[PDB]
Design an enzyme around this catalytic site. Sequence first.
Site, PDB file in Angstrom:
ATOM      1  N   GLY A  11       0.798  -1.213   0.000  1.00  0.00           N
ATOM      2  CA  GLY A  11       0.000   0.000   0.000  1.00  0.00           C
ATOM      3  C   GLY A  11       0.832   1.265   0.000  1.00  0.00           C
ATOM      4  N   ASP A 120      -7.859   4.036  13.796  1.00  0.00           N
ATOM      5  CA  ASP A 120      -8.250   3.753  12.415  1.00  0.00           C
ATOM      6  C   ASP A 120      -8.546   2.269  12.230  1.00  0.00           C
ATOM      7  OD1 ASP A 120      -9.007   4.218   9.766  1.00  0.00           O
ATOM      8  OD2 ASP A 120      -6.969   4.706   9.034  1.00  0.00           O
TER       9      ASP A 120
HETATM   10  C1  LIG Z   1      -1.535   1.480   6.120  1.00  0.00           C
HETATM   11  C2  LIG Z   1      -0.854   0.229   6.544  1.00  0.00           C
HETATM   12  N1  LIG Z   1       0.166   0.179   7.367  1.00  0.00           N
HETATM   13  C3  LIG Z   1       0.519  -1.166   7.439  1.00  0.00           C
HETATM   14  C4  LIG Z   1       1.484  -1.829   8.158  1.00  0.00           C
HETATM   15  F1  LIG Z   1       2.272  -1.108   8.976  1.00  0.00           F
HETATM   16  C5  LIG Z   1       1.653  -3.190   8.099  1.00  0.00           C
HETATM   17  C6  LIG Z   1       0.806  -3.960   7.296  1.00  0.00           C
HETATM   18  C7  LIG Z   1       0.984  -5.438   7.269  1.00  0.00           C
HETATM   19  N2  LIG Z   1       0.496  -6.068   6.184  1.00  0.00           N
HETATM   20  C8  LIG Z   1       0.691  -7.399   6.118  1.00  0.00           C
HETATM   21  N3  LIG Z   1       0.314  -8.038   4.987  1.00  0.00           N
HETATM   22  C9  LIG Z   1      -0.687  -7.597   4.042  1.00  0.00           C
HETATM   23  C10 LIG Z   1      -2.107  -7.691   4.612  1.00  0.00           C
HETATM   24  C11 LIG Z   1      -3.178  -7.423   3.542  1.00  0.00           C
HETATM   25  N4  LIG Z   1      -2.901  -8.249   2.346  1.00  0.00           N
HETATM   26  S1  LIG Z   1      -4.139  -8.597   1.351  1.00  0.00           S
HETATM   27  C12 LIG Z   1      -5.408  -9.292   2.328  1.00  0.00           C
HETATM   28  O1  LIG Z   1      -3.676  -9.599   0.447  1.00  0.00           O
HETATM   29  O2  LIG Z   1      -4.614  -7.355   0.821  1.00  0.00           O
HETATM   30  C13 LIG Z   1      -1.584  -7.973   1.746  1.00  0.00           C
HETATM   31  C14 LIG Z   1      -0.563  -8.430   2.769  1.00  0.00           C
HETATM   32  O3  LIG Z   1       0.753  -8.357   2.224  1.00  0.00           O
HETATM   33  N5  LIG Z   1       1.297  -8.169   7.038  1.00  0.00           N
HETATM   34  C15 LIG Z   1       1.766  -7.532   8.114  1.00  0.00           C
HETATM   35  C16 LIG Z   1       1.652  -6.183   8.285  1.00  0.00           C
HETATM   36  F2  LIG Z   1       2.191  -5.645   9.398  1.00  0.00           F
HETATM   37  C17 LIG Z   1      -0.190  -3.318   6.550  1.00  0.00           C
HETATM   38  C18 LIG Z   1      -0.313  -1.933   6.639  1.00  0.00           C
HETATM   39  N6  LIG Z   1      -1.203  -1.015   6.060  1.00  0.00           N
HETATM   40  C19 LIG Z   1      -2.299  -1.297   5.104  1.00  0.00           C
HETATM   41  C20 LIG Z   1      -1.787  -1.975   3.848  1.00  0.00           C
HETATM   42  C21 LIG Z   1      -3.432  -2.057   5.767  1.00  0.00           C
END
Ligand SMILES: Cc1nc2c(F)cc(-c3nc(N[C@@H]4CCN(S(C)(=O)=O)C[C@H]4O)ncc3F)cc2n1C(C)C
Length: 262
Positions: A11, A120
């Site tokens: 993202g 959030d």
């Molecule tokens: C704004 C934000 N800050 C984030 C952060 F600090 C860590 C993580 C994070 N993400 C993930 N993985 C993601 C989960 C979602 N999926 S899906 C269901 O295929 O769309 C993609 C996947 O790579 N794992 C651990 C995290 F900490 C995700 C984060 N996000 C968004 C993408 C939800």
Amino acid sequence: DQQYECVAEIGVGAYGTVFKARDLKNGGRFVALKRVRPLSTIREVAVLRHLETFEHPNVVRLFDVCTKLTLVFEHVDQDLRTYLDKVPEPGVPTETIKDMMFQLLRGLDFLHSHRVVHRDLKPENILVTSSGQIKLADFGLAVVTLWYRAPEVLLQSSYATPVDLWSVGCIFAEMFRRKPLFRGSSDVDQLGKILDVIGLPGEEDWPRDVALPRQAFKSAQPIEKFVTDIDELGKDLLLKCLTFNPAKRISAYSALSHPYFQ
Ligand SMILES: Cc1nc2c(F)cc(-c3nc(N[C@@H]4CCN(S(C)(=O)=O)C[C@H]4O)ncc3F)cc2n1C(C)C
């Protein structure tokens, strides 16, 4: 940091960018690397490091911090949004809804007890492991989604821990419906759609000195009309989360002891 090799973008936005990367020093496991471009930021990462000493099972592990700031988290393959989009008919099994809600509330009680407010909470940052474990992600650092925002955030009056319990109530309803309970397109439309369901609160429950008065907006509707699959105990907990006044809203700690979880 050559210790990581980015392979996909998870993202991008205000938060800089989050990448899925190979942790080259730790057996090539996947990690989520958050690159984010002071005193406020220094203190915030110190709080994140402190929370990681507890290693709570319902929040993502913070593996590393590099300094221009890079946070290294364990990677989880899916979020609650994707989990709900792929679950076959007739939906999430009753006991799976109960279990995920219990774990969500445990992760939230952990954060609230160490004075961290998520602010959030949404299916997109509620991660679901391959073994069904819930892990909170994207907290601690300062279409769009007002769908999970509490009335007091929409009104711009207060921002304490109850803000997350309103979000929990929206998510709890959505685990049954598999569609958002309150899908507004703006701060005022979101608040109107909320009050269309819960009704106008008492004049004394409306925050004083806010731009939007009670007069700008309605009778309470039976919540089972919107969440048909919910049981009596689940309904009682759902309404305690969806209480307009934040001081009267149930806390994550009391929610953990609700009869629904017995
Ligand atoms: C704004 C934000 N800050 C984030 C952060 F600090 C860590 C993580 C994070 N993400 C993930 N993985 C993601 C989960 C979602 N999926 S899906 C269901 O295929 O769309 C993609 C996947 O790579 N794992 C651990 C995290 F900490 C995700 C984060 N996000 C968004 C993408 C939800």
